[PDB]
Design an enzyme around this catalytic site. Structure first.
Site, mmCIF file in Angstrom:
data_model
loop_
_atom_site.group_PDB
_atom_site.id
_atom_site.type_symbol
_atom_site.label_atom_id
_atom_site.label_comp_id
_atom_site.label_asym_id
_atom_site.label_seq_id
_atom_site.Cartn_x
_atom_site.Cartn_y
_atom_site.Cartn_z
ATOM 1 C CG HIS A 1 73.949 75.694 -0.331
ATOM 2 N ND1 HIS A 1 72.801 74.975 -0.051
ATOM 3 C CD2 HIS A 1 73.647 76.968 -0.014
ATOM 4 C CE1 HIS A 1 71.854 75.754 0.396
ATOM 5 N NE2 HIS A 1 72.346 76.979 0.420
ATOM 6 C CE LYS B 1 68.639 75.820 5.133
ATOM 7 N NZ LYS B 1 69.573 75.802 3.968
ATOM 8 C CG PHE C 1 70.932 75.747 -3.835
ATOM 9 C CD1 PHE C 1 69.784 75.025 -4.120
ATOM 10 C CD2 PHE C 1 72.109 75.362 -4.398
ATOM 11 C CE1 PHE C 1 69.836 73.956 -4.987
ATOM 12 C CE2 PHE C 1 72.177 74.286 -5.257
ATOM 13 C CZ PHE C 1 71.030 73.571 -5.546
ATOM 14 C CG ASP C 2 65.638 80.078 -6.845
ATOM 15 O OD1 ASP C 2 65.255 80.784 -5.876
ATOM 16 O OD2 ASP C 2 64.896 79.889 -7.840
HETATM 17 CL CL CL Z 1 70.386 79.427 0.440
HETATM 18 CL CL CL Z 2 68.617 74.355 -0.390
#
Ligand code: CL
Ligand code: CL
Ligand code: CL
Ligand code: CL
Length: 124
Positions: free
Chosen positions: A12, A41, A120-121
């Protein structure tokens, strides 16, 4: 073998750019961060802020995670982010992503010592 914190940084963090440049940003970054290695992904978000600013979110607004856990934190201010999502026509190994640049609050799960982002939500 990769720690939870290192995997979050790899998947991220993109502090080298302040925002997604072209419509090709996601195809380039998903590949170079090794996210299209065994498969494509499907969804991934990159944050264009310094690592120190993202780590600071772990001491900001405590909120529930989508999964019901309570170690999620929402940033007080908005941040520059890029949403990368596979298009209907993406197919391993020819992964194709749609790039969507936006400015919004991020929600991350934090853990450990030091207490840093590990998942990462969502973004709001
Ligand atoms: Cl994640
Ligand atoms: Cl994500
Ligand atoms: Cl680490
Ligand atoms: Cl890697």
């Amino acid at each position: 073998k990769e720690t939870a914190a290192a995997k979050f940084e790899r998947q991220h963090m993109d502090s080298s750019t302040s925002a997604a440049s072209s419509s090709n940003y996601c195809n380039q970054m998903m590949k170079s961060r090794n996210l299209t290695k065994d498969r494509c992904k499907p969804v991934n978000t990159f944050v264009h802020e310094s690592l120190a600013d993202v780590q600071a979110v772990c001491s900001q607004k405590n909120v529930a995670c989508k999964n019901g856990q309570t170690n999620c934190y929402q940033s007080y201010s908005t941040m520059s982010i890029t949403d990368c999502r596979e298009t209907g026509s993406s197919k391993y190994p020819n992964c194709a992503y749609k790039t969507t640049q936006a400015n919004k609050h991020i929600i991350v799960a934090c853990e450990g010592n030091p207490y840093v982002p590990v998942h990462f939500d969502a973004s709001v």
